Amino acid sequence: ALKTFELRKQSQENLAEQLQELRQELASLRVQKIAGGSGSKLSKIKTTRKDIARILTVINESNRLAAREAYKNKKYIPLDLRQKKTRAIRRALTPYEQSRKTLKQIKKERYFPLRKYALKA
Amino acid sequence: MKFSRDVTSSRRKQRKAHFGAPSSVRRVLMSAPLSKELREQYKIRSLPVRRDDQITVIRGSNKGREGKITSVYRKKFLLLIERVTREKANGASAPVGIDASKVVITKLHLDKDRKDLIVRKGGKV
Amino acid sequence: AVSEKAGHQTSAESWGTGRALARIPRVGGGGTHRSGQAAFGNMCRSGRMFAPTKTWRKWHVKVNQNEKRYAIASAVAASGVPSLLLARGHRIEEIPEVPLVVDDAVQSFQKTKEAVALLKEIKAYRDVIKVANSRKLRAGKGKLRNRRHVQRRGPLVVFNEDTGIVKAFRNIPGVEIVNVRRLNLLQLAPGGHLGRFVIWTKSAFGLL
Amino acid sequence: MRHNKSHTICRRCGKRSFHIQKSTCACCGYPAAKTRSYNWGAKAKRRRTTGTGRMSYLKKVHRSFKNGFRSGKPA
Amino acid sequence: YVKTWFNQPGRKLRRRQARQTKAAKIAPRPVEAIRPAVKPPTIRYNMKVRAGRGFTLEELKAAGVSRRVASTIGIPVDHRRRNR
Amino acid sequence: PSHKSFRTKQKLAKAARQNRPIPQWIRLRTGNTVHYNMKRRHWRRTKLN
RNA sequence: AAAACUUUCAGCAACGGAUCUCUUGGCUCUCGCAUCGAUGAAGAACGCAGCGAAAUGCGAUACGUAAUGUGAAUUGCAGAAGAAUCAUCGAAUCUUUGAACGCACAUUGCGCCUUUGGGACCAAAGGCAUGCCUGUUUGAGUGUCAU
RNA sequence: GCAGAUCUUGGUGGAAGUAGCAAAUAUUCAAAUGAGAACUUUGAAGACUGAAGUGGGGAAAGGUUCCAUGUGAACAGCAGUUGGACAUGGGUUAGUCGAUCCUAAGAGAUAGGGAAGCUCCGUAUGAAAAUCGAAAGGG
RNA sequence: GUUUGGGUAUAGGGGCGAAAGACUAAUCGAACCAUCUAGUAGCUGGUUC
RNA sequence: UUUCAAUGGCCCGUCUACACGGACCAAGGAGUCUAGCAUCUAUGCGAGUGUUUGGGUGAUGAAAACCCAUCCGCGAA
RNA sequence: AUUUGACCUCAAAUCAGGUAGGACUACGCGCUGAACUCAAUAAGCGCAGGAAAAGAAAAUAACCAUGAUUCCCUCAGUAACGGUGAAGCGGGAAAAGCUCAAAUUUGAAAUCUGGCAACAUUUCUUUUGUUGUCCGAGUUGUAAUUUCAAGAAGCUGCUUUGAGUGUAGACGAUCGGUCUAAGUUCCUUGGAACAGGACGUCAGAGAGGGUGAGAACCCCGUCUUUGGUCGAUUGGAUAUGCCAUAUAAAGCGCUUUCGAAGAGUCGAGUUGUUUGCAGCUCUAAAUGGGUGGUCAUCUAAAGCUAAAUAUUGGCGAGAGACCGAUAGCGAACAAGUAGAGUGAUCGAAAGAUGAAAAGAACUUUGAAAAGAGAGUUAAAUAGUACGUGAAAUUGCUGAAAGGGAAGCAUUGGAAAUCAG
Ligand SMILES: [Zn+2]
């Protein structure tokens, strides 16, 4: 099968053409199965299916990194590019606004913080 | 006796883990000891069993038979050895299976990965 | 305890009187093997057992502290008598002295070889072999229930300070090591039988 | 004389419990937004509760949680 | 409804570990704060002395330590109690 | 009848595939208790409902 | 008054599945942890393997792909031969539905907006639910006013 | 620790090769297949349903029972070479036939009004404007 | 010598009924289903060497 | 052990003779756990008695065991 | 006339950006609520979390006074009510306090969301921010100071100070990677040694599991491990570097000062629910109001907050004086499956060949199915209808008895058999 890394160092159109010829080959392999083929062809059906899956994977990755580059350093980005941990974590308070304190509390923690002490036994 | 709490001692859990271990774990479970010359040559007591290894049977009805391994038939914790077969009713050859722990490895199949294993497991090449 | 819902999560009501059959409730429905069969009864198949076992049975029992201390003191006194040890079953025919006292030099042991050498040299190793030879396969459902093997009991080594004695002795079959300040009755007189063979150290004996 | 239907296959729960005239499923309560459930039907709850299906997302979340919900690509 | 106590050794072990974790976290300082000597408020127990919640403002001022820094150095303060 | 909807036909289609005999090779596998079919239905017998 | 028949006893053979032994199951107790969903949840449907009906897994990239670790398999046959029904898992895909969201759904029914492609028509991609909040734009008011 | 509880579950008996077998007049001869023919196939003969059919079609309902090939383990209160059973395959082709479109009885979203609330009234209603419902109706 | 197919409406001490104290999925001492419920027992039948 | 001869022998359980159950066999199957109170017995201590609400130690499995402490319970009117 | 611009109110948008639904429910908070004290239970409805709720006194007390909440022992089965049934105190587990409204910054809205542009930072190209500019919000009040424990305004002279940004080592922890001591030596039995006997070894490892029977030394593991070795994260401190801007802020002792404090709310009458709450008539005060018997104690009608506590659900584990296939979950198995009902729902049965299919080649009879010879195996008294294989019941063989019962007991003969 095609190696994923050398699939990555190619351009969009070549992967598109490789995708197209793979589909021709898969269609040819399946009609051999219907009309009667050898075990090599029946086993080749699976490996060519996986190789199209590899090409779809690398194409989608290249598109998504391209989109992330386009939306890099922006306030709003597509919901697919946004993180998805849980709905609760997304709705929760961020650490910055959990650490926000009034100036009254800032003065209190400036002047009377939790001191470092000890007792002699 | 075990003193930790991360490990189990229940017969139920040990058998479930043993007979449900995936192929990667059955590789370690299907280990065999080395011969005296091999042990003194690599400073290794036991090694995992791999195909195309030259082994000799130590226990069973084939005690003393010697040959290479044709396959480590993992999903039954079983080995298959060249010429260690059985005559069926018709006369065909049915391979006689031997447990991995009942044989001794008299000659290894050296590649870079196995040499890495030897030097990693407190051994010398 | 059994499940509190065991035998109840079916659906079965009594068919009534005059049915030419017993009045125990029977599962409703039809077309299935269970329909028409009885339920809700200790006699009935797949029914709740009589008085289902409960978790708040009295499992633990309170013993007066003075009674516990009385038993432990008597257990130590029993261990200091040769005849009770022979009845206990300890092979102490050639033990030089009972009670057996050993110097503090054994509280800093490091190897099972050293511990076994001491046991042979005091001639207490007959008891260890008796324990080792007595290892058997348990009779009954115990081995199904995580009680696979059964053996005897060997010498009880009582120490004062753990500097390596516990680890150097813990692997000899039958040898049980305990601190002098936490003498357990279950180890001093196991099985309710008095007079275990106990090996003391000097510091533990002085602290007794 | 028995050649009519009272219930049909439900869209939401795939059972033949969706009434025709009432147009409400007797099993799951569709088209109600809330799934029909009743505490007296403990067995009825456990026949249709979570875990009787694929749980495809929940297994994804659990494996993700076990590692602190990290994202990106390792070295 | 029954409340069984089969987790009593488990609770005891967990509390001890929590004390151990607390000690490890704030090791420089004692794990228990200073507590005032206080007399129970009844005719049956007015002959004893036990540990009160915290000191009062008058006691803090008489000692010379301010109510602000008293919390910082580990002296609990009770604003309800008064010295009669 | 001869006026079934698509959903009815599709449900019928898989119900016809479910009651088919089991291939022998899956039986011949090891550790495979499957040796017959316990979901075999017949049209004259129990209805699909 | 012999056979046959009936009954009793014993051996053997049947019928049946008790007993004994086991057990990747159940039950109970204890300890640890806090993690669903409009970025589409739980659930349902329909499909996916060379030879599969169920179970499991997965979603037209379909008994899966990417990445990391292991290091030479899978196996019932055939088959070729960084393999594998391996583990981990942070990158992706995820069909029809479902709170289900263009209108409906006992219907593979009926639409509208934007763009593109094909040799008016068709196809493809992206969109069109409700309530509420902050802001933006346009307004409506013989509501109050200033020129 | 069981002899009972019209006990539970499972297994097995005597009655007993006993009661009995289905309505719907009725079958016979020859040949072929076949291990095996009262029951399969062809011919000949005799009958029956007698257009209000034992005829040819459809709706509801069933769902592959349809057709070919093969089998005779199990089912067809006899039998079977046959079957609607089993096994392997094949088979439903629409601009004009229907659904889809419209609406009837009826159901019901929305704007508003109630209810502690899931939600009920309201649908032409005091709003800054529907939909579903007929494989026998209309087309 | 009115009947009836389909669609729809009416649901439980309710509906429906030219009224039989009738029908309401082979059930109407009072529809069916699941919980409370392991309901209530002066009573019956069994209760093991 | 089978069998014969003589003698004897009504079918068991339940319920107040009758009646009710019983075709046969195997397995299951019915005074249990718990809270309080009372008598008696035994054990420990004794004008005292009760560790396990709690704390400490316990490494070898640590839900056990061992140790420690003020209330408080009953009793001492 | 009427045109222009404001403010107020209300609309519309497939406007820009967000949010709510549904599911689980063991534990948690409310509403509602029966029947046979039942029971503030079950059912029904709403809503959360890892805990929830409660919580810093409009609290107890009558003391030498205690001092937020929660939980446990005790109070105590006491007070109280007519069987129900507390609380104060006392001993413990855990501890942590606070934030607003009510007063002018008036020499300066000093405050904040959003748009635009850069700078950054990340569990992360996925996160979170900084600055500048514009518009908007906002004087019908956003900032700073104040919360009654006080506090403000003067006066005083002592003390204190960052909501920062890199580098290194140590100290922990999470994830997975990887490391581990010794017989397979001899003889007998056996299909197989993992059994018995002999000779030995390791043990900080003699727990457990697998392997052709009871394996510490064949293998996995186990002890070492509260650790060595890899990597990736971080949490907090130490050393070290760089920015900050204090012309300030804060604590403490005095007052020659004032001290703002929550309304259809408290409260009363009436009806309803188990003092507490709600409906309704009516409706307050400012040394006032609430609570307890003039006194004592609190300061409501506004808000936040870890910990000890619960946890038949979910996810991981460790166990057991539990059950051992009519038992234990309904389900050890293709189980909420087959199947039943229009539906709500109801819901089983069924584990074991052998070490290894080695699953009986081949021949013969038979239409076939099968049988008989063989063959595999230690075993076919293991042939899948497969471990062991009981009873009821049935067939055959052998022995015996029998004229409308049979069973049983006592004595002895006859036959069979065993024994001293
Ligand atoms: Zn439904």
Residue numbers in the entry:
A (entry chain h): 2 to 122
B (entry chain Y): 1 to 125
C (entry chain C): 53 to 260
D (entry chain j): 10 to 84
E (entry chain L): 21 to 104
F (entry chain 8): 2 to 50
Provide the authors' original text about this structure:
Eukaryotic ribosome biogenesis is a complex, tightly regulated process that involves many ribosome biogenesis factors and spans different cellular compartments. In vitro, Fkbp39 binds DNA and nucleosomes but dissociates to bind nascent 60S particles and to partition them from chromatin through LLPS. This partitioning provides directionality for the nascent 60S to move into the nucleophosmin-rich GC, where its biogenesis continues.
We identified 4 major states of nascent 60S, and each state could be further classified into multiple substates. State 4, the most mature state we detected, has 31 ribosomal proteins, the ITS2 is processed, and its associated factors are released. Notably, we did not find any nascent 40S particles in the cryo-EM data, which is consistent with the mass spectrometry data and chromatin localization of Fkbp39 on the 25S rDNA.
